[PDB]
Design an enzyme around this catalytic site. Structure first.
Site, PDB file in Angstrom:
ATOM      1  CB  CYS A 114      -1.010  -0.007   1.178  1.00  0.00           C
ATOM      2  SG  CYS A 114      -2.174   1.437   1.292  1.00  0.00           S
ATOM      3  NE  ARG A 128       2.719   0.719   3.416  1.00  0.00           N
ATOM      4  CZ  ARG A 128       3.666  -0.199   3.379  1.00  0.00           C
ATOM      5  NH1 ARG A 128       3.742  -1.076   4.359  1.00  0.00           N
ATOM      6  NH2 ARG A 128       4.500  -0.282   2.334  1.00  0.00           N
ATOM      7  CD1 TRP A 142      -7.176   9.458  -1.478  1.00  0.00           C
ATOM      8  CD2 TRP A 142      -8.013   9.683   0.581  1.00  0.00           C
ATOM      9  NE1 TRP A 142      -6.196   9.962  -0.710  1.00  0.00           N
ATOM     10  CE2 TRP A 142      -6.669  10.130   0.565  1.00  0.00           C
ATOM     11  CE3 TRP A 142      -8.744   9.765   1.777  1.00  0.00           C
ATOM     12  CZ2 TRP A 142      -6.039  10.643   1.699  1.00  0.00           C
ATOM     13  CZ3 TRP A 142      -8.112  10.268   2.917  1.00  0.00           C
ATOM     14  CH2 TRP A 142      -6.779  10.723   2.864  1.00  0.00           C
ATOM     15  CD  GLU A 175      -6.118   2.616  -6.286  1.00  0.00           C
ATOM     16  OE1 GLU A 175      -6.444   1.515  -5.769  1.00  0.00           O
ATOM     17  OE2 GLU A 175      -6.219   3.725  -5.727  1.00  0.00           O
TER      18      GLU A 175
HETATM   19  C1  HEM Z   1      -5.771   6.792   1.881  1.00  0.00           C
HETATM   20  C2  HEM Z   1      -6.248   6.266   0.744  1.00  0.00           C
HETATM   21  C3  HEM Z   1      -5.443   5.105   0.135  1.00  0.00           C
HETATM   22  C4  HEM Z   1      -4.768   5.079  -1.032  1.00  0.00           C
HETATM   23  C5  HEM Z   1      -4.618   6.213  -2.092  1.00  0.00           C
HETATM   24  C6  HEM Z   1      -4.188   3.758  -1.139  1.00  0.00           C
HETATM   25  C7  HEM Z   1      -3.456   3.293  -2.208  1.00  0.00           C
HETATM   26  C8  HEM Z   1      -3.364   1.947  -2.487  1.00  0.00           C
HETATM   27  C9  HEM Z   1      -3.177   1.374  -3.807  1.00  0.00           C
HETATM   28  C10 HEM Z   1      -3.055   2.154  -5.146  1.00  0.00           C
HETATM   29  C11 HEM Z   1      -3.078   0.053  -3.636  1.00  0.00           C
HETATM   30  C12 HEM Z   1      -2.835  -1.021  -4.705  1.00  0.00           C
HETATM   31  C13 HEM Z   1      -4.123  -1.377  -5.407  1.00  0.00           C
HETATM   32  C14 HEM Z   1      -3.747  -2.279  -6.542  1.00  0.00           C
HETATM   33  O1  HEM Z   1      -2.523  -2.394  -6.789  1.00  0.00           O
HETATM   34  O2  HEM Z   1      -4.637  -2.872  -7.201  1.00  0.00           O
HETATM   35  C15 HEM Z   1      -3.226  -0.259  -2.239  1.00  0.00           C
HETATM   36  C16 HEM Z   1      -3.136  -1.536  -1.721  1.00  0.00           C
HETATM   37  C17 HEM Z   1      -3.533  -1.878  -0.472  1.00  0.00           C
HETATM   38  N1  HEM Z   1      -3.926  -0.997   0.530  1.00  0.00           N
HETATM   39 FE1  HEM Z   1      -4.137   1.040   0.297  1.00  0.00          FE
HETATM   40  N2  HEM Z   1      -4.513   2.999  -0.008  1.00  0.00           N
HETATM   41  C18 HEM Z   1      -5.300   3.817   0.794  1.00  0.00           C
HETATM   42  C19 HEM Z   1      -5.867   3.473   2.028  1.00  0.00           C
HETATM   43  C20 HEM Z   1      -5.843   2.224   2.588  1.00  0.00           C
HETATM   44  C21 HEM Z   1      -6.541   1.802   3.766  1.00  0.00           C
HETATM   45  C22 HEM Z   1      -7.493   2.644   4.665  1.00  0.00           C
HETATM   46  C23 HEM Z   1      -6.223   0.520   3.972  1.00  0.00           C
HETATM   47  C24 HEM Z   1      -6.743  -0.355   5.135  1.00  0.00           C
HETATM   48  C25 HEM Z   1      -6.605   0.155   6.377  1.00  0.00           C
HETATM   49  C26 HEM Z   1      -5.359   0.073   2.907  1.00  0.00           C
HETATM   50  C27 HEM Z   1      -4.795  -1.178   2.800  1.00  0.00           C
HETATM   51  C28 HEM Z   1      -4.307  -1.726   1.643  1.00  0.00           C
HETATM   52  C29 HEM Z   1      -4.095  -3.150   1.396  1.00  0.00           C
HETATM   53  C30 HEM Z   1      -4.319  -4.382   2.309  1.00  0.00           C
HETATM   54  C31 HEM Z   1      -3.559  -3.228  -0.016  1.00  0.00           C
HETATM   55  C32 HEM Z   1      -3.156  -4.501  -0.792  1.00  0.00           C
HETATM   56  C33 HEM Z   1      -4.409  -5.266  -1.127  1.00  0.00           C
HETATM   57  C34 HEM Z   1      -3.955  -6.545  -1.740  1.00  0.00           C
HETATM   58  O3  HEM Z   1      -2.879  -7.120  -1.334  1.00  0.00           O
HETATM   59  O4  HEM Z   1      -4.707  -6.956  -2.651  1.00  0.00           O
HETATM   60  N3  HEM Z   1      -5.106   1.159   2.085  1.00  0.00           N
HETATM   61  N4  HEM Z   1      -3.342   0.920  -1.521  1.00  0.00           N
HETATM   62  C1  1EV Z   2      -8.565   1.106   0.867  1.00  0.00           C
HETATM   63  C2  1EV Z   2      -8.042   1.167  -0.538  1.00  0.00           C
HETATM   64  C3  1EV Z   2      -7.803   2.395  -1.138  1.00  0.00           C
HETATM   65  C4  1EV Z   2      -7.314   2.434  -2.443  1.00  0.00           C
HETATM   66  N1  1EV Z   2      -7.070   3.632  -3.015  1.00  0.00           N
HETATM   67  N2  1EV Z   2      -7.098   1.286  -3.124  1.00  0.00           N
HETATM   68  C5  1EV Z   2      -7.302   0.069  -2.549  1.00  0.00           C
HETATM   69  C6  1EV Z   2      -7.028  -1.232  -3.307  1.00  0.00           C
HETATM   70  C7  1EV Z   2      -8.263  -1.608  -4.137  1.00  0.00           C
HETATM   71  C8  1EV Z   2      -8.099  -2.862  -5.006  1.00  0.00           C
HETATM   72  C9  1EV Z   2      -8.859  -2.892  -6.181  1.00  0.00           C
HETATM   73  C10 1EV Z   2      -8.818  -3.958  -7.070  1.00  0.00           C
HETATM   74  C11 1EV Z   2      -9.530  -3.896  -8.140  1.00  0.00           C
HETATM   75  N3  1EV Z   2     -10.174  -3.853  -9.110  1.00  0.00           N
HETATM   76  C12 1EV Z   2      -8.002  -5.040  -6.797  1.00  0.00           C
HETATM   77  C13 1EV Z   2      -7.224  -5.057  -5.629  1.00  0.00           C
HETATM   78  C14 1EV Z   2      -6.348  -6.282  -5.374  1.00  0.00           C
HETATM   79  C15 1EV Z   2      -7.119  -7.581  -5.682  1.00  0.00           C
HETATM   80  C16 1EV Z   2      -6.350  -8.841  -5.314  1.00  0.00           C
HETATM   81  C17 1EV Z   2      -6.401  -9.971  -6.138  1.00  0.00           C
HETATM   82  C18 1EV Z   2      -5.685 -11.111  -5.755  1.00  0.00           C
HETATM   83  C19 1EV Z   2      -5.714 -12.343  -6.617  1.00  0.00           C
HETATM   84  C20 1EV Z   2      -4.925 -11.115  -4.571  1.00  0.00           C
HETATM   85  C21 1EV Z   2      -4.885  -9.962  -3.772  1.00  0.00           C
HETATM   86  N4  1EV Z   2      -4.160  -9.915  -2.607  1.00  0.00           N
HETATM   87  N5  1EV Z   2      -5.607  -8.876  -4.172  1.00  0.00           N
HETATM   88  C22 1EV Z   2      -7.281  -3.976  -4.717  1.00  0.00           C
HETATM   89  C23 1EV Z   2      -7.761   0.007  -1.234  1.00  0.00           C
END
Ligand code: HEM
Ligand code: 1EV
Ligand code: HEM
Ligand code: 1EV
Ligand code: H4B
Ligand code: H4B
Ligand code: ZN
Lengths: 411, 407
Positions: free
Chosen positions: A108, A111, A280, A285
């Site tokens: 993420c 953070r 947000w 994305e």
């Molecule tokens: C402040 C707004 C936020 C922005 C702009 C942001 C940005 C992102 C982006 C661009 C990704 C990757 C998505 C992708 O590659 O498909 C991501 C992944 C992730 N974020 Fe955030 N994030 C935000 C808030 C949060 C919050 C509130 C959480 C939970 C407390 C969070 C937890 C995670 C997790 C667990 C992933 C990886 C999900 C996965 O492994 O599939 N994020 N973040």
């Molecule tokens: C809170 C928050 C804010 C923000 N700006 N962005 C996010 C991540 C959202 C997210 C969207 C998609 C989609 N479409 C897939 C994903 C990942 C889907 C995926 C797919 C697989 C196979 C494994 C794995 N760990 N994750 C994430 C979250």
């Protein structure tokens, strides 16, 4: 053991000691790196060490390590486990837990925001209807008429693994995809399978290009049930371009609230299997993935056709060109409507500052380069040139199998 | 132990078995992943030799045969007596081709089997070296119809008698410290451009000055040589639509030719082995022109397009990045110098992976280096899971010689 990372653009070298608190596994060995692989019922036996690890962290953070209050909570948790096989977090522990799961979320980029997270405690919830109510309140608070606030809603923890709370949607808000008999897709192709489940369950499908899916909610290991999010709660933004007037006629819009609902929150050994959290968007994305993946809305063709680009040789960079204009439009559409959004240049710069502050103040910052660098313009953002170490800290967010694969149907 | 790789766009799943024949170490532990890090006796030489000769005789369908056993004995004798051995020509060609086949960071490997190997093991001086290199450059350039090739100077003996090419590429532009305070030319080579001046370089002080070769033979002090200018095919860069582009007066060279790496075949170390192929467009347009560390010309460009440079969110850097890259590609194709765009390069590498799974049981790929530094997710490699592991024969980084040379 000290580990060092370098930035190749600035020659800044940082030192990671935090990796020394690392618990779970990577999937990597000395003989293989699995850094680009997407995916690389618990007993007393293993639980108390984990409980103890957590409470030690917590009590260090609040400046109370080895306090009476600390020793007492330890013995208290001990008993509860030996007596019931599980335990209950105090409010303050839950909050701290969910904040750190985000802090430790190495994939993420967002953070820098980790300390500002509104935690909603839904640990008294018992039914799907209650689940629906909690989620609606989550979405309304988080949306905040376009001034998005980060939030998470936490439902009761796993017990015997037969009484699980799950949110079957992978995001709270998402468009239906419908595979057609000609083989083409209407709406969002990522969501076809889940759309079918919803129809199966008895959703009446509007069959449009942008249908907000209904929540499918499982409480206490029961069969899950359907619920429409009130449309007034669903903030959407029509997509238009600042110079290009034909763009709106593409008929595109997108929702403002990214809210991940399908992950598992692990705190002190406890497993919270429904913990939707929301933030947000980073523009890419929607602009890169949602619209321009081939397996998604795949609108590069249409934007390119309409842009009268030379589409006969890939080396016109016609795809590259359309991709930029779409992302320009996404940022522009959100900003005009005053719906919170960050562009990828801004988000990576902030993240580099977060990351350096984390090394200075915490001794490290687990970071997954494959996911952190944005999916366009990688090398003109400063994360590209940043060496990162990936490792797993707890508390954490984890993937979990889709519930339709593991649920015993009660009928 | 049988590992799967999934493509997320096509759902195609591949099964990797080649990784168990994997030799060296990655950098990673099951505790810490080092994927994003740039650089993570005779009692030991014989196993290395045998490992190699076994794969060689296996590739020619002659495994466990007379010639095979004969060779293993011969090399054993030579090691026990001399403390090293010499590769047959055939083994040499095979080793080099395979060091490229095993290069986990190379998107270009569909080309692996078509490599021209120049055996410079009889070389003895820096003048000799210079001749071999001029000839390599000329052969590989081929008036724009670029051809892959590698030139192999003599292997390491006792490590005090090394052949090295001090340049990091055969052909690169100079970079000078400036009184002003800004950097002139190409900043990547500042240190190198100074060491040239210091040994006596005729530095003409410009912005696209081809650097002189700086060659060390048999462990001796190194020497300077200007590649004949008529051997260095350069390209003036222009836009197919922006007539003002040329006024920046950008040129780039046609020939990428890596020369600071070490080639290991069957335990032996070839520390001077420059090789060359042809450019992917983004290597020049995205990195060479647009890095902060490099020519850094985005600001200067975006202005000419008159874009709103006020807010990062107008994506003016991204808009300009694309046009810069359209232009590099356009010029090369118009001057008829071989070049590949990232769409085509990545597409070709997927075809290549498929082949390498089908025919070899896998393909070590390093995703961080394979995905282009622009437009990642719209190239197919983005969605492709890859496994990264070190096979041999192989190419390796080695200390810049000046930080190591007994002077
Ligand atoms: C402040 C707004 C936020 C922005 C702009 C942001 C940005 C992102 C982006 C661009 C990704 C990757 C998505 C992708 O590659 O498909 C991501 C992944 C992730 N974020 Fe955030 N994030 C935000 C808030 C949060 C919050 C509130 C959480 C939970 C407390 C969070 C937890 C995670 C997790 C667990 C992933 C990886 C999900 C996965 O492994 O599939 N994020 N973040
Ligand atoms: C809170 C928050 C804010 C923000 N700006 N962005 C996010 C991540 C959202 C997210 C969207 C998609 C989609 N479409 C897939 C994903 C990942 C889907 C995926 C797919 C697989 C196979 C494994 C794995 N760990 N994750 C994430 C979250
Ligand atoms: C034929 C056309 C070729 C193309 C299009 C190509 C493409 C590339 C690209 C894009 C990179 C990324 C490196 C960077 O961004 O700096 C790379 C690295 C590399 N390629 Fe190739 N390549 C070609 C030929 C060759 C040849 C002939 C060899 C060796 C025989 C080779 C071996 C390598 C090695 C070892 C690296 C990584 C070097 C390092 O670690 O710095 N490639 N290649
Ligand atoms: C044959 C061939 C064809 C082709 N199209 N491209 C290449 C790679 C050439 C190359 C370019 C740069 C740059 N800029 C840096 C480098 C080296 C960057 C580097 C730097 C360091 C410190 C270590 C390490 N392993 N690599 C190489 C080769
Ligand atoms: C630290 C980071 O891995 C480093 O900047 C890498 C990233 N990916 C790269 N990829 C390529 N092809 N070339 C590079 O020089 C780099 N740099
Ligand atoms: C195969 C590969 O690991 C996979 O498609 C990853 C690559 N990097 C990513 N990066 C982000 N931010 N989101 C993703 O879904 C992916 N997908
Ligand atoms: Zn790894």
């Amino acid at each position: 053991r000290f580990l060092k990372v370098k930035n190749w653009e600035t020659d800044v070298v940082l030192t990671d000691t935090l990796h020394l608190k690392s618990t779970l596994e990577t999937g990597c060995t000395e003989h293989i790196c699995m850094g680009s692989i997407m995916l690389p019922v618990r007993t007393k036996d293993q639980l108390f060490p984990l409980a103890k690890e957590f409470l030690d962290q917590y009590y260090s953070s609040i400046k109370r390590f080895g306090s009476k209050a600390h020793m007492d909570r330890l013995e208290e948790v001990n008993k509860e486990i030996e007596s019931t096989s599980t335990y209950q977090l105090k409010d303050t522990e839950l909050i701290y837990g969910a904040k750190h799961a985000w802090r430790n979320a190495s994939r993420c980029v967002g953070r820098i925001q980790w300390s500002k997270l509104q935690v909603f405690d839904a640990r008294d919830c018992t039914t799907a209807h209650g689940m629906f109510n909690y989620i609606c309140n989550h979405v309304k608070y988080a949306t905040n008429k376009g001034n998005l606030r980060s939030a998470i809603t936490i439902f009761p923890q796993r017990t015997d693994g037969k009484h699980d709370f799950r949110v079957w949607n992978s995001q709270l808000i998402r468009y239906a995809g419908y595979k057609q008999p000609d083989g083409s897709t209407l709406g969002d192709p990522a969501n076809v399978q889940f759309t079918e489940i919803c129809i199966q369950q008895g959703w009446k499908a509007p069959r449009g290009r942008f249908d907000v899916l209904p929540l499918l909610l499982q409480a206490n290991g029961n069969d899950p049930e359907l619920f429409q999010i009130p449309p007034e709660l669903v903030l959407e933004v029509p997509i238009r371009h600042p110079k290009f007037d034909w763009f709106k006629d593409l008929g595109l819009k997108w929702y403002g609230l990214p809210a991940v609902s399908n992950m598992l929150l692990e705190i002190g050994g406890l497993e919270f299997s429904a913990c939707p959290f929301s933030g947000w968007y980073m523009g890419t994305e929607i602009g890169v993935r949602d619209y321009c993946d081939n397996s998604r809305y795949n609108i590069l063709e249409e934007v390119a056709k309409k842009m009268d680009l030379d589409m006969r040789k890939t080396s016109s960079l016609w795809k590259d060109q359309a991709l930029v204009e779409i992302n320009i439009a996404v940022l522009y559409s959100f900003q005009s409507d005053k719906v919170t959004i960050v562009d990828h240049h801004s988000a990576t710069e902030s993240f580099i500052k977060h990351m350096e502050n984390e090394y200075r103040c915490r001794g490290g910052c687990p970071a997954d380069w494959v996911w952190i660098v944005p999916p366009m313009s990688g090398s003109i953002t400063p994360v590209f040139h940043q060496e990162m170490l990936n490792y797993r800290l707890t508390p954490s967010f984890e993937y979990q199998p889709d519930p339709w694969n593991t649920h015993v149907w009660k009928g």
